[PDB]
Amino acid sequence: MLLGTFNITLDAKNRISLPAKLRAFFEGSIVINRGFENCLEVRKPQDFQKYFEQFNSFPSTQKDTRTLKRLIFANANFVDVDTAGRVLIPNNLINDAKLDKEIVLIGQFDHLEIWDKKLYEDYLANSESLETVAERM
Amino acid sequence: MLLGTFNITLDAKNRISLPAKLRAFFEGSIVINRGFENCLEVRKPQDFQKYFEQFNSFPSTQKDTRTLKRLIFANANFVDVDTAGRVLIPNNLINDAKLDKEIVLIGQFDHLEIWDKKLYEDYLANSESLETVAERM
Amino acid sequence: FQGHMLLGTFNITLDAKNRISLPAKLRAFFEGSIVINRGFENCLEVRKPQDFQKYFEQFNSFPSTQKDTRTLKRLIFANANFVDVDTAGRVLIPNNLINDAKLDKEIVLIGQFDHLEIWDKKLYEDYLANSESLETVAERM
Amino acid sequence: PTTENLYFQGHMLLGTFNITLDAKNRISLPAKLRAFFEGSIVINRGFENCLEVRKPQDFQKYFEQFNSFPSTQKDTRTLKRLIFANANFVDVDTAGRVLIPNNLINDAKLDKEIVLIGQFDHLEIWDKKLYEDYLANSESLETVAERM
Amino acid sequence: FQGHMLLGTFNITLDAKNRISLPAKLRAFFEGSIVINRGFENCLEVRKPQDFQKYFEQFNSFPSTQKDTRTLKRLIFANANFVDVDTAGRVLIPNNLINDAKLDKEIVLIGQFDHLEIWDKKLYEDYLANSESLETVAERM
Amino acid sequence: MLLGTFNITLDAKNRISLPAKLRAFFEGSIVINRGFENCLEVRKPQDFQKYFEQFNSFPSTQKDTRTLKRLIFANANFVDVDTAGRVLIPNNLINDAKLDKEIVLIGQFDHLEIWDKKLYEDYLANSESLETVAERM
Amino acid sequence: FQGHMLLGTFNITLDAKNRISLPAKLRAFFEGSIVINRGFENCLEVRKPQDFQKYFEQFNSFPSTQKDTRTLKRLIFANANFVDVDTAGRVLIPNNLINDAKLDKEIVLIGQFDHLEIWDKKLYEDYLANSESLETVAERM
Amino acid sequence: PTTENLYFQGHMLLGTFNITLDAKNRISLPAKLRAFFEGSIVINRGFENCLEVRKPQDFQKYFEQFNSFPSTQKDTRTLKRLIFANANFVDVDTAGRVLIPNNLINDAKLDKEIVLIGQFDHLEIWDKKLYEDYLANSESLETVAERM
Question: GO biological process: any one (chains A, B, F)?
Fold first, then answer.
């Protein structure tokens, strides 16, 4: 289970050190891919496996399904968690998530999201209430 | 199963002593996270596991689902129940639930909810009848 | 069977210490513990913990993301309690529940197969007095 | 009673029977019917004022049918309360007699002259008059069926 | 199979004692007892008790909280009876049923696989005389 | 597996010799009954059993169902396939299918249909295209 | 798998005796017998009997009381045939089918996984020439 | 390749790879990819002019998803004919190379400079230009997703 919020800094070599309470969750490898609202998702390969299983539940004969799958997997990568718990974030992803300095890692149980601190707070700042959003489920 | 209403006080160190009939239900660890209507939910990690899986039945390709998942899990945490049955509530959650002094714990079978006494009574004060709400299910 | 089906109507009195003696044909059904909780139309339900377990699971088929679901669950479980049936088959009804069901003196226990309901005699008779026919209600199912 | 018949009488309740209500409010199960029932039955009030009689097991299955009904719905609760609060276990004595409860005698307007009709699953008890009136009114077999 | 399917049309006479002799190819299908009950379009149905058992199971799939379901079941089972097939393959048709089907003299037995139907010859031909085509009726299923 | 089209003649005693490739499929007995569009169907009693169970999924409380069932089964019959592979078609069925001389047997996998050569060709003559009919399924 | 998957396009000639030699990669797939039947858009389908069995079972999920269902089943099975694949891997195509598919000289066999389709080279190319895009057609599924 | 990496490389196809089309029309599977495939693959033309590559077993599963489609429907038949008539088994040689069929080379406008993108289930082969154009156009991740 990936839970919580974490404030960390983006390395000079574009790496982020997984907190610690988090390193435990991951093995020596993760899949990254770009997320929604410009955030970058991080999962254990096995979880990515299941995540993809949720996509295939979608038609695929439908153009949108193909665009979604291509946008996701075409920017997805395996990344080894080094001995120090660090992860090198790909150039393409650094840009997609506007990662600069000051990152926010939020646990989403299944996966972990990497945010630019500013963007995340802005997301939170906008964004409707918990009751409002929930009522629409 | 968690049943009942309990009136307790918020510790000076921001902790609450699980009643007793309740300690039984929990092991040495719980997940907390913010609830709906400003209340903080408490569950055994295993139950949190099942609670989460209930979300994955929701689109995910939908913006609202993502907001919901981010408002919940980003504010969820593992908290150890100390030897005395006390649980230390995180700062963020204390504020989200406007927890001050005088808490109300209500058993919701699956989980437990932590309320600010005032807010809860106000919630109960407003809130339609049991029959009215039920008829709409 | 005859001890696994809660059926019938029973007229009993509320104890001076707020307890009710389970009839007998009924004690059989229950072990040494029951869950009580407030019911609909001001009545208090009584079930074996296991049956309460199943009753609840039915509620998990309800959204939860929906506001009404949360209100329902909160009005029900916040007012539910475990109560031990003493050696004499008596059950002490909590203060809050005594009030919610306007229990005073003269109780009516009706078996609902799954559970048992506790009613203030007056309120129950009024409920029955109002209330549409069996055929009418049924046709709407 | 041939063993072939015996076998079915214990499997299905069929037929119409005219009997009298005892002075002590009992009815003697016909015979072809006693076979179907053990030593205990559940009675409960039925629809159109008729009282139903079932073997406890069958009553068990009958009830599970009601659990597919909401219960958060006020009507469901009324239905369940009108039925089970007026349901009772009754022992079929040695002579095949069943003593019908006061409340049920009144609800079905039972006086003297009863009609027992087998509904396969259960058996219904009617006041002779009420039953014939029910049959007198009541649309045709084809009419009712077409609406199913 | 060549003895577990009621197929065909048979013209027979109603006994002076209100009985019908099962053809023969038919007797085979039935044991020593049958269930009769009134059918639709005034015809009387005949089944082996086991088949009646299954036929009933097709009804209970119907509400029963619905007034129509109760009327249907009462109209059917209240006129249903067990009838022994005598040594000569004859079946005594109850008075009530004789009247319901306007049975007089000259009966038509049509096999419906599951059951067998008894018709007054006139009424049956009239039914056939009216009645839409096979294609028409079928298209509406 | 009953497949194909066969042109045969109606016997003087109202019988048809099952082709041969066909005799194989049937045992020594068949059920005949009138079909749709005036054709007479032929099946193995076992298959007739399954065909009937298909009707039982239909109302029965519906007048049309009862008519359908009465038009089919009242005109169904068991017929023994003699030693020479001949089948004597009942009077009633000969008339319903306007059988005279020159029959067309078409395999329908499940069953076999008997047609008056003229009527069949007319049926085929009219009758929409394969693609047209299929598109409406 | 490489012999449990009919894939590809094959250009072959129609024999002087109206036969076609199964490519080879294809013979593997088939045993010594196949069912042919006329396909959609004038093409003739070819399957292993077992697969034909499954293909048909799909058609039974269709009413049958519906006129269209009956026409469909009659247009298909009445024109279906068992054909033995000879020692040389040749298959003799029935006269009726040769005509239905306008088979002359120059055939195109396309694998459809489940089955194989036989086309007149011209007709196939025309089909391809017309025919919307892969994306267009797919979006409508 | 750590044994863990190898494990995952044989479980999912991920990543973007830039390679060159051989003079004999072959591509050398990257390496992290060869692990995923055995000695044979099925190719077939994809959507948006891209050619798909799968392990025969996966192609098996891919196809089954198609049988949920009518078939009596003209479009289903066109879809199945446009896909499978242009599908082929291709052996991955000893050097990890795959020779792409003429027809598929043309259908995907393959020339020189190919992009292989892993779609977990399968792998897509693109003409570098066409792929970037596809990416260039193409709405946002959030936008597309919101319509699912």
Answer: negative regulation of DNA-templated transcription initiation
